[PDB]
Structures are given as C-alpha cells and as structure tokens.
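Re-run requested by the PI after the first attempt was lost when the workstation crashed. Everything re-entered from the original request form. Ligand of interest: 628.
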Amino acid sequence: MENFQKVEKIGEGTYGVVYKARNKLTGEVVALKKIRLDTETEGVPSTAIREISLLKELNHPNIVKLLDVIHTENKLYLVFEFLHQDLKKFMDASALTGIPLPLIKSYLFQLLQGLAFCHSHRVLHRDLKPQNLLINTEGAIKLADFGLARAFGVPVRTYTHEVVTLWYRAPEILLGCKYYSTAVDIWSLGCIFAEMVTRRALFPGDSEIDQLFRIFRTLGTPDEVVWPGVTSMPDYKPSFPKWARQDFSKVVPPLDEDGRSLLSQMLHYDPNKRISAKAALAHPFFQDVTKPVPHLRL
Ligand SMILES: NS(=O)(=O)c1ccc(Nc2cn3cc(C(=O)c4c(Cl)cccc4Cl)ccc3n2)cc1
C-alpha cells in the first residue's frame, strides 16, 4: 500500500473510497478502491478473497481490468485500470444534444459483448448503472465493479450512507427472487440503453415499491400470463395495482423499430424470456454497428 501515492479522491463507492493514486514502482495511474475491513473483530473473509481472486482472471476488453488485490494490514485494496470518464458524466455532458445514435449503439454493443463474456463464465454484475460504465477517448466502454457484488454484497447505503440507486434493478430482484440470473444485467443494460436514447432515466424510483410500480405503470403489472410464477414470488402482493402496458413508441422515441424491438426483449418481465447478451449481439439493430469516437473533455 505504501507503493501507492493518492493523487485525488474520485468516488465514495459502494464498498469504500475510490482514489486516483499512482504506482510508485511502475509509475502507472490507477483507480484504488479501499474496502474497509478490520483485522481481528473482522478481517477480510477468506471466501471473498477467493472470489476476488477469480475476478483478476476475468479479462476482457469491455471489462475494467483488475490489476491487483492487496490484503496487507488485514485490509482490502483493489487496484483497477484508470479511466477518465464514466457514462453518467458523459450523458450529463451530452444532455443538450444527446449522444449520437451510432455511439449509443456502439456502447450497447460493447457492453453486451462484455456481458456475454462474464455470463459465459457464470459471473453476473448485479448492479449495472451509468456510474459503473467507464469510457475512454478511443470509443471503448467497460463494465466496472464486475463481480464485487457476489464477492461482498450490495448494501442499501454506502459507507458514506449514500443511498444505492434502484433505477436499474430487475423486477425479479425487487420481487424477492433470491436466486436471480444473468438476466438481471440485461435488464439493467436495457434501462441504460433507454436512458442514453431519451436523456432521462427510464424508471427513476426512489424506493423499492416506487421502483416496482414505475416499472408496472410502463410495462404493465405482470401476471401469470406474461410471467409464469410471478404471483408466487416472495414479495409479490395480489393487492398490487393492475396497470395496463404502454406502447414502446411512447417510451423511447425516436428510437427506430430495431432498437425498440431489441429494448423490448431486454425488458421482458420473465427472466427466461428476456434476451441473452449473446442473442442480443445478433439482433438486427447491430447490423450497421460502428465504433465512433466520443467528444470527451477530460
Ligand atoms: N466523474 S468522471 O466521469 O470524471 C470519472 C469517473 C471515473 C474515473 N476513474 C476511474 C474510476 N474507476 C473506477 C473503477 C471501479 O471498479 C469502481 C469502483 Cl472501485 C467503485 C465504484 C465504481 C467503479 Cl466503477 C475502475 C476503473 C476506474 N477508473 C475518473 C473520472
């Protein structure tokens, strides 16, 4: 740890503080994540240690590379490759004119590649969001904090008591499914996709029930017809209001039919009907995908 020199705090993270230190040996600039853990009264669980050690191997161009895991002093530090911008900041900077469709499509395509990879390794993200997607000057976008959920967990509030966003949570998670699948990442990515297109969060709930109900008001309250087994879910209430489904043309204009079609499949209620990352990659929406360069101001 003495091998690193912090240059500036860049994030409060969900597990701990994220610094932009420099490696004193190699001289590289990196993203240092400090996961708080005691020594005796706690001390990093062996389990998490082996989990994280498996993520060090999960290398893909669309996944932020985990350079190292330092456990010294009985504490946990994660050293990640550094990026200058996350998608949230980029969308905020592109709010006035909107991110060009070609770039939106490129990012969606790359992220699906990243997910296809992780998912083929039985590793799910669980908490995809704009702030966790990082981009560079070359037009690449990468999944960040991948696997750190299963490793540790996803708390309601971060160490800074900051509330965790529910906007991208799949319905099965909200309904209490304890053993959800890779389909949850596809849902989150679908929500992000819509947001890049419309320049407004698709389902900005501020509570679990508000999130669920916002989803219901748009996609219609799910029932046994569109989601077999939904009424038997841990948190499903027969008393849920019954809202009728809305047209996608009204949800993401002016996205073309191919994008709307693809989005509809990424937002299917039934996790088993929801399109997989691999299948999504073959969607007609991507027949003319390219890799534009974004206009980034670092
Ligand atoms: N705000 S902004 O656009 O200027 C902006 C945004 C990001 C960065 N640098 C950066 C942060 N960062 C975080 C991770 C992670 O793995 C990660 C951790 Cl550790 C905790 C929470 C979220 C993520 Cl993603 C991996 C690589 C990485 N590079 C610089 C500027």
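Saved to the shared folder this time. DSSP finds ten helices and ten strands in the chain.
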